[PDB]
Design a protein around this ligand. Sequence first.
Ligand code: NBB
Ligand code: NBB
Ligand code: NBB
Lengths: 119, 119
Amino acid sequence: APDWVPPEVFDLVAEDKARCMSEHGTTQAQIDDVNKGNLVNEPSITCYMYCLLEAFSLVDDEANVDEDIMLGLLPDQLQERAQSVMGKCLPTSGSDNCNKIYNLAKCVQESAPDVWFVI
Amino acid sequence: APDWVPPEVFDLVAEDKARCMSEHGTTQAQIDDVNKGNLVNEPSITCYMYCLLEAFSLVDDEANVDEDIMLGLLPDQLQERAQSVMGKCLPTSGSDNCNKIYNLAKCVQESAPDVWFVI
Ligand SMILES: CCCCNS(=O)(=O)c1ccccc1
Ligand SMILES: CCCCNS(=O)(=O)c1ccccc1
Ligand SMILES: CCCCNS(=O)(=O)c1ccccc1
């Protein structure tokens, strides 16, 4: 992940990472690819992102981001940049929940590739 | 219903929607509620879902689901997502036909909000 990610997040997500990878057939290799800017629209990775976001209430049942909860989780250092990115990329839109998260990731990647990551 | 639902289904279901709502005392408000994630175990809605499924030959007289045709009628991306969810949530179980379909809908909505919809 990017160097700014708080160490605690790696432990906080561990339980849901395992569950979500199992549920969606996700490989660590796919995850490693999102982080190197190589995102593809395949449910095994896009629904995995949805799954992990939902675990932390970062999105609701229609894959709309909760900006407050997202800003809460992000370090103080990223507040300004993240708020700008959210302004540009939200609300989410797409045919289903996984597509909404794919579309969101692509939007964030355009301006701010280091703000999005997959764990 | 979700944005991914094929346009054709709204016309294809119309005849059976009328018949099934009439048979079960269903109101549109109840159908709207399911699509908002507010599924309640009332036979006027749970038996309605059974009735629509039966109309498409997706259930038999004991609310056994035809997994292969149900999956086959879904768009490609939903079909992929649904393979794992239906793997988990099928076969149906419950005290009667309407409870079996309630339990199925609840199971699907827990993993995959945006997959179980009603018209
Ligand atoms: C801008 C943030 C990116 C979110 N991507 S993620 O689904 O892998 C995820 C990462 C961390 C916590 C929850 C989900
Ligand atoms: C001919 C129209 C196809 C129906 N496709 S559907 O995705 O709405 C669907 C509805 C109910 C069960 C499975 C799929
Ligand atoms: C993924 C399957 C959803 C089934 N929901 S339904 O039984 O109300 C229904 C909707 C549309 C056509 C037939 C049945």
